[PDB]
């Protein structure tokens, strides 16, 4: 069950999907499982709902796993999954939250490449697509967004690790996300989870311009820092993609937020470098509850 469950340890994708239908089964007024598409390789694509009804409700996005390699965030995705179903009646400030909107969380956002991860290289970062005429794989997923598609920040090289793919949505794990969030029409926030470096970014990375909505999302996103400070005293740094950890084209939240959803962030988790994406599974949990805070403080300004 998911009161058995190792939360401390990494997990297997076959672990994480098994999980899932555990806490459906156990909280089934609250948490539904949708299929979004499939995979290059025919892998499910799920997403968990979190919702105590009403009908299209006012939603906040979350994925995690873009990049397969980035452990700490399908850990993160399966604690706070876990923690939801815990707190919803009995934190006032998530029980206001989940009464006024639904919550899409989406665990392992690239499921071939987590695969690949545990069975062949451990640090593989893109999708699993076949590339013509090419002897090398996969496109990286947080490239491939319709958002200064192609541009500085990503490369046309199918070899490389930010290759975008051969046109904006090319990759099914991002088509399928499109196609639901514009489906929906009620998103008001849309956060993506990667590591590291531990940075809370908004936009854009595509270009030096800033955002008309600037101070805001700034605002909050000093202040969703200082709550994950809080606990531990992790410390994170704090603006746009480009001023904070470089350039980068035909990423998550340039679209999103070009589509209209303000609320348009991206963390990278910890460390800073000292493990890098073999952070250990001894800081899953404190990692999971700072980040915690980190989301419930966006989802506030969001509601
Ligand atoms: C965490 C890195 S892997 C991430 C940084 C980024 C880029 C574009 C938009 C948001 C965040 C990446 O390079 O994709
Ligand atoms: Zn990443």
Redesign the pocket.
């Known amino acids: 069950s998911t009161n058995t469950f190792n939360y401390a340890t990494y997990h297997t994708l076959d672990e994480i999907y098994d999980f899932m239908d555990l806490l459906v089964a156990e909280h089934p007024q609250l948490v539904s499982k949708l299929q979004i598409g499939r995979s290059y390789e025919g892998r499910p694509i799920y997403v968990l709902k979190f919702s105590t009804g009403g009908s299209n409700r006012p939603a906040i996005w979350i994925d995690l796993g873009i990049?397969s390699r980035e452990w700490i965030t399908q850990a993160t995705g399966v604690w706070f999954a876990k923690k939801f179903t815990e707190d919803y009646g009995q934190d006032p400030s998530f029980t206001a939250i989940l009464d006024s909107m639904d919550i899409f969380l989406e665990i392992v956002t690239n499921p071939d490449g987590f695969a690949f991860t545990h069975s062949q290289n451990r640090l593989w970062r893109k999708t699993r697509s076949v590339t013509s005429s090419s002897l090398c794989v996969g496109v990286d997923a947080?490239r491939n967004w319709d958002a200064g598609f192609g541009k500085a920040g990503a490369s046309s090289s199918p070899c490389s690790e930010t290759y975008h793919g051969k046109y904006a949505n090319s990759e099914v794990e991002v088509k399928s996300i499109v196609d639901f969030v514009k489906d929906h029409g009620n998103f008001k926030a849309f956060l993506?989870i990667?590591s590291y470096?531990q940075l809370l970014?908004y936009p854009y990375?595509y270009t030096t311009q800033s955002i008309p909505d600037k101070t805001e999302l700034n605002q909050v996103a000093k202040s969703a820092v200082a709550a994950l400070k809080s606990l531990y005293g992790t410390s994170y740094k704090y603006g746009s993609?480009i001023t904070t950890?470089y350039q980068?084209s035909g990423?998550?939240?340039?679209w999103s937020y070009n589509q209209g959803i303000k609320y348009s962030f991206?963390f990278?988790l910890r460390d800073t470098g000292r493990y890098g994406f073999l952070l250990p599974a001894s800081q899953i949990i404190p990692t999971a509850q700072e980040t915690w805070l980190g989301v419930l403080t966006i989802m506030e300004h969001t509601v």
């Open positions: 990049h947080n993506s990667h470096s970014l990375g993609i950890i980068a990423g998550s939240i340039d991206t990278e």
